[PDB]
Design an enzyme around this catalytic site. Sequence first.
Site, mmCIF file in Angstrom:
data_model
loop_
_atom_site.group_PDB
_atom_site.id
_atom_site.type_symbol
_atom_site.label_atom_id
_atom_site.label_comp_id
_atom_site.label_asym_id
_atom_site.label_seq_id
_atom_site.Cartn_x
_atom_site.Cartn_y
_atom_site.Cartn_z
ATOM 1 N N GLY A 1 0.074 -1.543 0.577
ATOM 2 C CA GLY A 1 -1.123 -2.070 1.230
ATOM 3 C C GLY A 1 -1.457 -1.247 2.467
ATOM 4 C CB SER B 1 -1.864 2.767 -0.254
ATOM 5 O OG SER B 1 -0.642 2.655 -0.938
ATOM 6 C CG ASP C 1 -1.902 10.179 -2.747
ATOM 7 O OD1 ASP C 1 -3.040 9.926 -3.212
ATOM 8 O OD2 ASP C 1 -1.031 9.329 -2.474
ATOM 9 C CG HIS D 1 -2.006 6.068 -4.087
ATOM 10 N ND1 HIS D 1 -1.491 6.770 -3.020
ATOM 11 C CD2 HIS D 1 -1.884 4.764 -3.737
ATOM 12 C CE1 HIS D 1 -1.099 5.929 -2.074
ATOM 13 N NE2 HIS D 1 -1.328 4.694 -2.485
#
Length: 223
Positions: free
Chosen positions: A175, A177, A84, A40
């Site tokens: 953030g 992530s 992911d 992502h």
Amino acid sequence: IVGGYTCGANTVPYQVSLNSGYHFCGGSLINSQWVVSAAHCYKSGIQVRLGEDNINVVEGNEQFISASKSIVHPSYNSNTLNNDIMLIKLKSAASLNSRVASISLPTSCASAGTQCLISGWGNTKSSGTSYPDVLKCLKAPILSDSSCKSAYPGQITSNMFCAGYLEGGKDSCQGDSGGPVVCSGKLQGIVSWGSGCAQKNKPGVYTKVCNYVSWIKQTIASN
Ligand SMILES: N=C(N)c1ccc(CNC(=O)[C@@H]2CCCN2C(=O)CCC2CCCC2)cc1
Ligand SMILES: [Ca+2]
């Protein structure tokens, strides 16, 4: 990172920042030429920033290296964030030192209750918005799959695990992530998703890296 503490400069040497004019995601160095992040987090024009502590100040141990390629997992599903994970190749090999170090890939998975280290430059508030310039750290245990699935019914896959505290107050956040979850000296997780941040009964969800080791090893040897 909500409810954590300042890591201290380069105490998490495998932690990278992905930058495209600005920090937009975390990542993990797994060797001098390759980074692991979240799918992502994909975008073109990525610059990998290693050796970072304060991301708004040049303190002297930084290495800024552009991405030559990105490989999102073949099975990534943006709707559900299943698989992911993404690999990013550096255009030139990082110079490894005590400040810029790779993190080992797991040989096996980690079990529920195992303590891990989660780190990142993400939001530090449960409500509202405050971004730190220095790296934040959080010790958090891996939660059982049943408490994970109970929190997020019909949303958790075999490629995901929860970690954190069901009472809330300590969690990763926006953030963060793409960032590392490190347990027992191995990269077991990647910061993926969750509902809000540090909310009761809404633990953080992490990509389960141990399921991707063969794919990781295979992909970087052929690219
Ligand atoms: N509380 C946490 N541990 C936490 C940590 C990091 C994040 C950042 N991730 C994100 O914001 C990701 C990106 C795309 C939508 N998204 C979400 O979290 C939304 C929920 C997702 C969308 C599809 C399945 C569930 C979100 C939550
Ligand atoms: Ca810096």
